Amino acid sequence: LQGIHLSDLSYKHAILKESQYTIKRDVGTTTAVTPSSLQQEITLLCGEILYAKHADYKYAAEIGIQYISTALGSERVQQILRNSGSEVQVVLTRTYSQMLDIHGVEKSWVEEIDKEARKTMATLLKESSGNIPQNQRPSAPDTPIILLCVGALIFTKLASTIEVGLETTVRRANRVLSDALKRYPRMDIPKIARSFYDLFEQKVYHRSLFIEYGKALGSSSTGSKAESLFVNIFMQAYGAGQTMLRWGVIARSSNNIMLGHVSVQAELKQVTEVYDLVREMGPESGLLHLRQSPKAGLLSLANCPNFASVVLGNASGLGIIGMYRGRVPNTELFSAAESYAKSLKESNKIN
Amino acid sequence: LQGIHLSDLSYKHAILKESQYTIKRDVGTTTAVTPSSLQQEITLLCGEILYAKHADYKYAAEIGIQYISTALGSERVQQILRNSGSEVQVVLTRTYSQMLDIHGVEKSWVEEIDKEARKTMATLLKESSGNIPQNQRPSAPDTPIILLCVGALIFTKLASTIEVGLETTVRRANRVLSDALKRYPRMDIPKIARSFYDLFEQKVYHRSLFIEYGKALGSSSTGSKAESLFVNIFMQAYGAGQTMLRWGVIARSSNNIMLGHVSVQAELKQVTEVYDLVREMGPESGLLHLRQSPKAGLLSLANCPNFASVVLGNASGLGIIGMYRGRVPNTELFSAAESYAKSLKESNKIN
RNA sequence: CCCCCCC
RNA sequence: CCCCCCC
RNA sequence: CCCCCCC
């Protein structure tokens, strides 16, 4: 009975990876970028969104992506979009009287944001004593990263739902971005997060662009505190869409007794197959659900209901499960694992 | 008695694989493709099938395959058809006044579908408040993938019968494609599935084309949620036509006691030969029955009636057998294995 | 189909 | 988010 | 001959 072995998942991944033909999508579409020579101007825009109370926050995400394009460069951004499987033709950004003319972003919107910000600045300078510090002004060099930090907060919740994503973004940005909120008292995290979620859902190649910025930022030798915060949040998104695997390795670390049942031990083989596929893909496996790589779903543990039920029960026992919305297929294993997990958490045993 | 060994199955596969002559079929036949430059138009057609209630859904499968041809490209599609063992001459697609002239698809049909869809859109715009969202319109970019998702649902049931295939397609598409059904309330999954089943049976080289699209989609770096769903369904088709091998590895994982009988232990040698042949073919072994590769049938376990009966009994005991229509040759082994499988399922043993 | 918590 | 002492 | 279930 040693030879009765199939290895289906490795074969599926081998089929998906070994393709001699490249897909082509978004052939007739275009997107906007801004060259690095305009970074000092786009920073202003990315900051002129933050300290004023704007009626429409619709294209804030596009301005954050514009700053990313200034950071990497226009040619590198076109190359990134091309290697992301999307045949989008980059459209460059121009200036006019100065202000920016970003493609697909109406000049009325940019003018409205700039005018609202100028009026707010004049009002806060006229009434107050005219002692605006260097960090409270729109031309601060970390304002684009503060906007991209809200974007990165909503990036970590792209596997989740829209409403859960917005609530988590607001809750976490009131604390993660407390200093920016103090510097810019009137920044509407809900609307900016909504804009970023809309951008990430509509233009999926910008997820790849956004990921490339994270790499280009994490590999840098120096950075401000805003960029370090952005990288911290960006890395919090790494295992997005695959929390079941993380809870499985947690259960294995917990030495759950219900892991030794007959059905769990029956499915452990294909479970180890899923983990081997994770290792096979390597570093980019974590970014599969963030990118909406169609290859995602090879890492699903839905084909092991007893293992999934035991792991969710262990998570519920440790209190980790929180408000996870997954299904528990086998309730008896879930409850038994929960009981053991509570017993282990409550008990204090030292070796 | 160590040398009394034959290895017939390896020899049969060696004969089949090591052929110096290539077959030629469909020599005088032609098929239609659409170049990528028309993708933005074909998308419309692939979506103009979905939100209107059409009398004839006869060539919907050809429109899905046309979108696949736009995605891969005309030259790559001709090459795919050539390497699939079929000498079909590709015929390109043209436009006229705009609409498409697909070869083998009557222009009356295309005009009828377009006119029905335009009339339905006008009716739903005139009566309603004229607030059609961006996902409910025919020009949505995931509509071709929604049609190909119905096609992929009927693709997983190509080893099954036509009626079972259509019933499963409707049942699964009311749930898998619930969001598309909400977006397009009036999409007739039965008729579209019938069209796709007819296409897959008549033109078998389009199975190879359809498989190539799955690879070109699974290997992509990014994709929409529709394409991820399509790849999920496409991978659900992987072991099609070979569920007996999957249930055999399930039985081995279950540690069924009836595996140790004399006749089961007698046939385990050639059973392991079948599994070794699976490993020998490698990743493409799963796609043999989907492709109707004549080499399929080397993976049949019909020459091991006692092993097949024990495995089917184990499956019936675990409740996995469902409504499987295979034959049980040896009823005593089937019943004994079923009894042990029920006993193991009912019993909760933890190591 | 998949995903779904907290940081 | 992270960091946080003494030398 | 083979295939045949569910997701």
Author numbering:
A (entry chain A), B (entry chain A): 3 to 99, 112 to 365
Task: Show sentences the authors wrote.
The viral genome is encapsidated in a sheath of oligomerized copies of the nucleoprotein N, forming a ribonucleoprotein complex termed nucleocapsid. The nucleocapsid is the template for transcription and replication by L, which is also dependent on the obligate polymerase cofactor, the phosphoprotein P, together forming the active L/P holoenzyme. In oligomerized and RNA-bound N (N-RNA) the nucleic acid is threaded along an extended groove in between the NTDs and CTDs of laterally connected N protomers. An important function of the C-terminal domain of P in nsNSVs is to bind to assembled N-RNA, forming an N-RNA/P complex.
Upon recombinant expression, N is known to take up host RNA and self-assemble into oligomers. Template-free 2D-classification of particles revealed that the sample contains primarily rings with 10 protomers. We obtained a 3.1 Å resolution map of 10-mer rings of N-RNA, a significant improvement from the previously reported crystallographic 10-mer at 4.2 Å33. We observed that the overall map quality was slightly better in the CTD region of N than in the NTD region, hinting at a degree of conformational heterogeneity in the NTD. we also determined a map of the 11-mer ring at 3.3 Å resolution. A structural alignment of the refined N protomer models solved by cryo-EM and crystallography shows that these are highly similar (r.m.s.d. of 0.5 Å). The 11-mer of N-RNA possesses a diameter of ~188 Å, slightly larger than the 10-mer at ~180 Å. The ring expansion by one protomer is accompanied by a slightly increased angle between neighboring N copies in the 11-mer: 73.6° in the 11-mer vs 72.0° in the 10-mer, in respect to the center of the rings. Thresholding of the map at a low level indicates the presence of additional N protomers, however, this density was too diffuse to fit more copies of N, presumably due to heterogeneity of the sample or conformational heterogeneity. It is notable that in this arrangement the RNA strand is obscured by N protomers belonging to the next turn of the assembly, suggesting that a conformational change is necessary for the genome to become accessible to L/P. Taking together our cryo-EM reconstructions, we observe that the lateral interaction of RNA-bound N protomers can support a range of geometries, demonstrating the plasticity of N-RNA and supporting the notion of a highly flexible HMPV nucleocapsid.
